[PDB]
Symmetry: D2
Subunit: 369 residues, 4 copies
């Protein structure tokens, strides 16, 4: 039991610009605002709560090491890397291609530290120095496919980490479990043809991106059957999420027998998130983390690495993230002060449409060898 924790100051310095989502735009009458939806303060407040709560005293700080060009090229194209260097070199940075993904001047340095934080924690868990950990990285990763930045993501951090373990550590099988509320299309893309990385995405159906995350997207060639999408309807809460964990996610992991589990740990499924419509509470994320850590203990010697994805409530995300940290440390010392306010809103009964969405995926488990 030693739990690694990655925070780098520059994770809080990501420049999301002066827009809300896209850039500010006078002709469209999109007024500038101080905090873009993805502003780094949300994740910084999570870090600061980790410290102020005293959880930091039970964690082993791990320094990020910047990802090299060669590290990035394991997961991404040369053109993509060149384009990110171009944008980062501009005097005020700029949009990276999709119109909602700003990088500041010099912001490539932070993207390298974000991917490198995930890699470094993976490395140190795999040696046995650490039993597990949480890499509280920013910018996020899971939307970025081989040849682009997308959806606030510059490089696919979890895929860079999985690529490292496969290339360097002699790991035959790795699983990436993504519970960010948005479809992990980038991760799905990168490993589409590859059975050596089982990619699972639990998400709100068609939330982002628009035309993806269907359960019929199962990979190709040798990789067919090694991508599992679990699209859930808007309004799904703890009961639906936990049913999905018990009926689909955990059985998939046990069938596949990964040697390492990487969690794309977003908190944008929270009850208070502006960028999705789900009803998960901190206690829901707690139970999700507890189940996944316990699964890792059973099947891969406890080797589990959490890597921050999205989440957009500066108010509530810190308590969602703290719950996961407490499940790693085993020190449960602070309440969720929003518990009683949120518990009365619902989401804790499994609805028939939620049950049916999960049942659609159960047959795909038979094809995991």
């Amino acid at each position: 039991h030693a739990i690694g924790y990655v925070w780098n100051t520059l994770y809080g310095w990501v420049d999301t610009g002066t827009g809300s989502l896209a850039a500010a735009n006078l002709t469209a009458r999109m007024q500038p605002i101080s905090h873009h939806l993805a502003h780094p303060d949300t994740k910084r407040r999570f870090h600061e709560l980790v410290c102020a709560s005293g959880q930091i005293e039970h964690l082993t700080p791990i320094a990020a090491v910047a990802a090299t060009d060669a590290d990035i090229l394991r997961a991404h194209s040369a053109a993509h890397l060149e384009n990110m260097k171009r944008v980062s070199n501009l005097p005020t940075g700029g949009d990276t291609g999709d119109g909602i993904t700003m990088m500041g001047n010099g912001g490539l340095e932070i993207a390298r530290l974000s991917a490198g934080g995930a890699v470094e924690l993976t490395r140190r868990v795999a040696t046995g120095e650490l039993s597990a950990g949480y890499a509280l990285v920013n910018p996020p990763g899971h939307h970025a496919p081989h040849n682009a930045a997308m959806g606030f993501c510059i490089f696919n951090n979890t895929s860079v980490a999985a690529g490292y373990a496969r290339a360097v550590l002699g790991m035959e099988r790795v699983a990436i479990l993504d519970w960010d509320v948005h479809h992990g299309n980038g991760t799905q893309d990168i490993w589409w043809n590859d059975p050596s990385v089982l990619t699972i995405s639990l998400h709100q159906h068609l939330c982002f991106p628009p035309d993806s995350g269907y359960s019929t997207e199962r990979g190709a060639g040798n990789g067919h059957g090694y991508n599992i999408n679990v699209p859930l309807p808007p309004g799904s809460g703890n009961a639906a999420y936990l049913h999905a964990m018990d009926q689909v996610v955990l059985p998939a992991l046990r069938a596949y027998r990964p040697q390492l589990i990487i969690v794309g740990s977003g908190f944008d499924a929270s009850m208070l998130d502006p960028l999705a419509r789900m009803m998960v509470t901190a206690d829901g994320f707690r139970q999700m983390a507890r189940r996944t850590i316990d699964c890792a203990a059973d099947i891969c010697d406890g080797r589990i690495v959490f890597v921050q994805e999205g989440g957009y409530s500066p108010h509530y995300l810190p308590f969602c993230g703290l719950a996961v940290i407490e499940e790693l440390t085993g020190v449960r010392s602070l309440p969720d002060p929003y518990h009683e306010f949120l518990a009365g809103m619902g989401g804790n009964t499994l609805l028939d449409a939620e049950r049916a969405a999960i049942e659609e995926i159960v047959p795909l488990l038979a094809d995991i060898r």
Copy 2:
């Protein structure tokens, strides 16, 4: 003919404090934040868009007139009025009662101007000077019952306005249609025994408060049948809302034949709102407004007054509000720049559970004489 518009600078000066929802609290480790969820910038950004878009050139600006004690006592108890001016007269103000509802020293001035904005616009529409209008007030109203402040609401603005229309203008029947995503419990309470003010609330079921808004809440005594709740499931979008408008709301208004329609116009049912889980877009709000305004044209010579309630997306609320203003002016000159991004997310299909929730209410129409 002429459309009134109320904005007062002090609506943007409401001091929501340094907490997120409740106050910042060091022992709970709730870190202070610049913008409380209910910070006035959200509604100020709506006002600024009304101006910057050119909509202000098609509106007649109407100054708020502070609500008198006489005005406030038509909706509220003598003890409540005394208690707010007791609280406002305290050296730094204080707690109105529920732990999420601030008032500053002299913050009664803003509460009076908010209610008075609704009254003054009502007076000018109901007397025939204006055809209709929008009062972009703050603080909001609909959670304040006869004897208390609640859920960010000091006085029940729409009920103060309805009370004025009844007692001063001699209207025999008024309807208040509340499409803020939270249950209008305050409005329901005030008029509970009174068939002369038909109160309708469309809302996310049990979102806030956690214990009201059931469709069994129908009024009492002579008021029985003149309160209609339409609780909707989380995830409901444009399709559910428009189905509710056509199957329940418009028929209720036609059966009742109000001489004035007041709309409690919240935008917290929007797709990007943190404080509910609904999926309405600016186009949904546009169609809701168009339907209600056309109903008013048919049954009460177009006498319709919109009064701002909640809504918590500083990014997207301005476009939701602008769409409603455009339906009043008839000048549709600015695209919603979020439309394509949000359209893909859904909410645009009437789901069986949404339809069933609305169908439960249809039999209640028979009792509206």
Copy 3:
């Protein structure tokens, strides 16, 4: 009689980006920040106080009308106008030339409204519809010379107004009195050879720009003697400023007999300004305004137009501006709540070095015909 007042919502929407002064830059480790020093909220808070104080009920609101190409060319070169059109048309705008003055895409719209606010107010004062007024414009103007943007100024608003007054309003003489704390180098340049616009600048010596504002800069050719710089030492307060008004500025205006006085009204000489080291309080600005308005009454039928320049204290600038507005309206209804706090800090004694700096300018007065 009537006092005109210009505010346009877009003046508050100028996007100053994510840096402090220059852009954020990660190599330099200049961390992004929400409010650039020149963020438009400072001027917006002045506008909001004009309204909240009740001064707006004593003012005649005057809509800004976009400055035309012909208007701009009375102060600037064809090349500069075309370059601003070029930068504003770029997909995400850009650098206007100096590395720090930026325009967003379509930002030319705001620059035209800023200059056009000054023009429209000037027209309506000159015709006698209004006796005087205040144009609370943004972006500012006085650093922009004939052939460039500079120091966050796109067009020289007061020179566009002066040029309009000369060519369209028939005025043979105009004076521009600039009491922004920084040297009005742009205004000086534009009218350098022209005795028909007397240009006066009171400023902190070498504050910005670093190499101009010496009292030896007196114009050339027919314009020799018709530019007057009054550089003052850091730490100069109410005593120095009022002595400079009494000994130099008012005598210059009286000797010149302008038909209109345009004031470049900055408040960055205030006691709490980050971007200069001067000690002027709201009462100092009040007295400067009272004196200049009274001078206008004596020499040009009261024709005086105030046009906003700089000022960077969001806390205190609103009260400095309000004091000027109160001298225009004659309604003195709110105290400066900082009065006692700032009065104790000094600046209210004429120091020998301050007296000496002002006495250096006196011989230049003899040459004004």
Copy 4:
């Protein structure tokens, strides 16, 4: 190429709730509109901390955890009555002002005030007794305006006096110096040690900037403490030349005469060229030279024992570079330019003006009475 340099930051220093006003509270009747960042908002000091980390300076520092100041610690500098009153405000559901109408605190805010004073104490404990050579305690809230019996001017407890008190009573040092270069007069520190020659208190400040009624050169202490308080009031517009002249002519000679066993620096950066709360012209290079001179003095006279403790400073833009310059002088690692250097160097302040010279000359005769 350096010995161990202690550094104190605690997350809660960044969580001090300064409210919704500018200076005093927001006030509707006065028409003081609410604002996100109060002048004294903790982000300014947090931006300094984050630059220490992002610049790589943190790799050359020894992080030292704050230890909460105990009642006994606070009572070496303050009255029992003052300690008791800070508890009450700290219990209020949203906190409140503590006395003077500009000194906001929270429910629980005493926790942070104890951690601020305790950061100064803990660094002092480790520097004295030789574990560390020197250090910087980047604390918040600040200290120097709080006198024996009150909170004042954003200060709850007098952090540097709590540290000096510990050094005197617990470590048994006979002589301590507190050098305060925050731009405002250190009236609280002056008050606490007024009668006491065992703590030499020096304050460089803008004359009558804050408070409005103190900091004259005739305030020299009383009784056995007569001659062991030295004020150097300077005129508005004073810059690097004035401050370095003051260091060379008054401050450093005073320290050499007094022979303190420990030098505590009340390290504010509100004398900077871009500060809203004073009218001085010091640049980061100025603060660099001031720090270099003071550390070298400590090396000469008290075995290098020097503890910097954060006081004021209100430019979130520029303060981090001023603070970083001081940190670089402690580590000897000079890896980042001041990006404002050229912009500010043209503004002046680097020539000694006659009135500046005169203000400093007035104080030189007081050096004769330091025994």
